[PDB]
Amino acid sequence: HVETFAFQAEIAQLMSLIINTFYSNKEIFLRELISNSSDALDKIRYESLTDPSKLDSGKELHINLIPNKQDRTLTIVDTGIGMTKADLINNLGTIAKSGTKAFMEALQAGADISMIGQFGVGFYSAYLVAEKVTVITKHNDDEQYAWESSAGGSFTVRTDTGEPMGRGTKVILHLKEDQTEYLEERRIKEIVKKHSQFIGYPITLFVE
Amino acid sequence: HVETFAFQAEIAQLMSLIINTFYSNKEIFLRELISNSSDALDKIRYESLTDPSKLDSGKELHINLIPNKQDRTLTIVDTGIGMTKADLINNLGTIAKSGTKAFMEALQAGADISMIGQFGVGFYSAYLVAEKVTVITKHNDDEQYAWESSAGGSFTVRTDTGEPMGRGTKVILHLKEDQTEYLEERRIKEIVKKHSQFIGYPITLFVE
Numbered sequence: 339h340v341e342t343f344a345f346q347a348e349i350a351q352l353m354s355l356i357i358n359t360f361y362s363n364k365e366i367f368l369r370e371l372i373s374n375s376s377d378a379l380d381k382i383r384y385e386s387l388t389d390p391s392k393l394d395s396g397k398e399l400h401i402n403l404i405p406n407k408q409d410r411t412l413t414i415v416d417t418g419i420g421m422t423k424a425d426l427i428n429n430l431g432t433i434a435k436s437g438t439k440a441f442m443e444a445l446q447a448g449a450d451i452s453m454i455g456q457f458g459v460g461f462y463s464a465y466l467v468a469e470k471v472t473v474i475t476k477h478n479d480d481e482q483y484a485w486e487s488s489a490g491g492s493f494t495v496r497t498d499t500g501e502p503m504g505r506g507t508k509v510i511l512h513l514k515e516d517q518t519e520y521l522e523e524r525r526i527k528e529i530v531k532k533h534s535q536f537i538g539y540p541i542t543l544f545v546e
Numbered sequence: 547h548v549e550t551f552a553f554q555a556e557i558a559q560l561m562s563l564i565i566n567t568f569y570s571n572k573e574i575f576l577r578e579l580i581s582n583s584s585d586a587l588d589k590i591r592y593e594s595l596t597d598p599s600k601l602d603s604g605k606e607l608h609i610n611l612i613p614n615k616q617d618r619t620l621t622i623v624d625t626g627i628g629m630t631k632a633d634l635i636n637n638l639g640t641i642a643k644s645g646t647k648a649f650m651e652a653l654q655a656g657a658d659i660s661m662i663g664q665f666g667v668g669f670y671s672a673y674l675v676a677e678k679v680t681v682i683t684k685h686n687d688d689e690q691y692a693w694e695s696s697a698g699g700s701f702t703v704r705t706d707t708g709e710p711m712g713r714g715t716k717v718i719l720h721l722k723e724d725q726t727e728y729l730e731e732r733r734i735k736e737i738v739k740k741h742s743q744f745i746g747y748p749i750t751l752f753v754e
């Protein structure tokens with residue numbers, strides 16, 4: 339059964355600015371997501387140093403970029419640390435609140451949207467290119483969840499019955515109609531090269 | 547009683563390159579250290595969301611830059627999550643090993659030293675400006691430690707009998723003789739402005 343939650347007003351605010359503002363340099367969504375994955379692989383790797391059994395849900399620490407033209411999706415998968423239900427519903431909301439206010443103040447000082455990751459709310463750049471985002475995630479301590487928002491002030495969470503994923507986070511981008519350049523192999527390659535060349539984990543770009 | 551440890555060969559290697567290479571843009575040591583603190587405050591803040599008693603060792607999450615001309619030291623203090631003894635001796639060594647190899651490969655491709663933080667070995671940029679580094683640190687789960695290295699292949703760790711610090715990390719830079727510009731108020735201000743303007747925690751610069 340699906341639970342529907344309201345975003346705190348400040349996150350709603352941020353998701354609308356990202357959606358409504360004219361800002362043509364949308365491609366940074368991809369370095370933000372890949373950074374987010376890089377951060378989650380670091381946390382699982384570190385944890386596993388003092389508790390090797392934390393890697394029983396999978397030994398490989400890696401990033402996969404999967405485009406799907408027929409579904410119009412670009413999916414970013416990592417086998418990072420994952421998100422618990424509390425993360426999805428309470429924790430990330432709390433943190434994103436003060437990063438949003440800083441990111442908000444910064445813009446009314448002449449910062450721009452590409453700097454969104456310095457404020458720990460990188461994830462929301464997904465709304466530059468996606469009309470809907472679905473996040474499948476599995477943490478060691480909790481069940482597998484599906485989270486979802488087309489923005490407009492609310493999100494849902496359900497327990498996920500799909501393919502079990504071991505441990506990590508899949509971020510599925512349902513791309514806006516004018517944004518299908520990010521399904522193209524040479525375009526994704528160009529962005530990873532330009533913005534993500536030094537990520538400490540293999541990034542595999544799947545072909546269609 | 548003081549325990550002396552050898553750095554793994556790869557870290558020794560990196561500490562010598564940093565020390566021996568001609569590279570005039572030394573001021574980035576400060577953004578790397580302040581980033582490291584920012585990362586440690588984030589981890590304590592997050593932990594405390596699911597366990598408020600983690601903040602009993604101190605509620606304030608903040609960065610202090612303290613210069614001392616008579617001691618020739620610049621100290622960076624945070625009240626972040628801290629380092630356990632295992633961190634100091636085993637854990638950070640393990641992580642710094644593969645970040646060093648990537649940072650090493652990157653340079654023999656025309657990357658430069660300012661990019662050291664993308665490889666998770668930012669901390670070692672301290673050796674651009676300091677002949678000796680001392681790190682006092684307190685984690686919730688362990689005792690207070692003093693760690694220390696003038697490089698040359700070894701470091702020491704002892705339990706620290708000094709002023710108890712609550713929780714966090716003080717990084718004390720014993721500056722090389724030609725590097726005292728970083729004791730000057732207007733110089734530190736210039737670097738924080740230039741490289742660290744958007745840190746999510748108050749950074750207080752102490753005067754002498």
Ligand SMILES: COC(=O)c1c(-c2ccno2)n[nH]c1C
Nearest residue numbers: 426430434458459461473485507
């Ligand atoms: C994986 O998605 C996220 O990172 C996320 C966030 C988030 C990440 C950073 N700030 O918020 N909130 N809610 C979700 C599902």
Ligand SMILES: COC(=O)c1c(-c2ccno2)n[nH]c1C
Nearest residue numbers: 634638642666667669681693715
């Ligand atoms: C606070 O000092 C450090 O961050 C550190 C490190 C370190 C940080 C990042 N890589 O290594 N190793 N050993 C020490 C004492």
Ligand SMILES: [Mg+2]
Nearest residue numbers: 345346349431
């Ligand atoms: Mg919210």
Ligand SMILES: [Mg+2]
Nearest residue numbers: 553554557639
């Ligand atoms: Mg070592």
